[PDB]
């Protein structure tokens, strides 16, 4: 039975990665409110933190969160293979990162602005406001807002 109570060790709505986590949901599906964290990248991080996956966010400890931080911004360290990372072979760098938090679109604006100055056709599309992966813009996406 999972029916345990405790009392005042429970805390809902805590901050992570300069963003604020939901109070109570299964932690894998909890931390995902941070951009750069998917339904899996949270599933694999929580396992490596020895956290109960069927516990809830307001549970665990204060330090167990601080360990989840480590595995997230140091993913290549914790046996998480490179292909589980979004940032693999990052442009000029060559290293495999995982871009997280509010850092996600900053790295996104970076490659965007990168090939904007390269003036490739794929980038020009972004500047025009058009579709890049594209295909037919003929009949699709109209009244785009």
């Amino acid at each position: 039975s999972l029916v345990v109570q405790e009392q005042g060790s429970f805390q809902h709505i805590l901050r992570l990665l300069n963003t604020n986590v939901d109070g109570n949901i299964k932690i894998v599906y909890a931390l995902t409110t941070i951009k750069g964290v998917g339904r899996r990248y949270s599933n694999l991080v929580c396992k490596k933190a020895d956290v109960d996956l069927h516990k809830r966010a307001g549970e665990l400890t204060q330090e167990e969160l601080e360990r989840i931080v480590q595995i997230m911004q140091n993913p290549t360290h914790y046996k998480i293979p490179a292909w589980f990372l979004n940032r693999q072979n990052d442009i000029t760098d060559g290293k495999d990162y995982h871009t997280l938090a509010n850092n996600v679109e900053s790295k996104l604006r970076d490659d965007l602005e990168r090939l904007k100055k390269i003036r490739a056709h794929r980038g020009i599309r972004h500047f025009w406001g058009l579709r890049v992966r594209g295909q037919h813009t003929k009949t699709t996406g109209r009244r785009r807002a």
Partner: peptide, 29 residues
């Protein structure tokens, strides 16, 4: 591609500003 991305002119917001002609709806014979 220089004037292409340097163009003010051509764009989406540019076309999205002015509105559609009457020719979109026309047919028969």
């Amino acid at each position: 591609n220089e004037g292409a991305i340097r163009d003010k002119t051509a764009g989406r917001r540019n076309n999205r500003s002015k509105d559609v002609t009457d020719s979109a709806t026309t047919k028969k014979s």
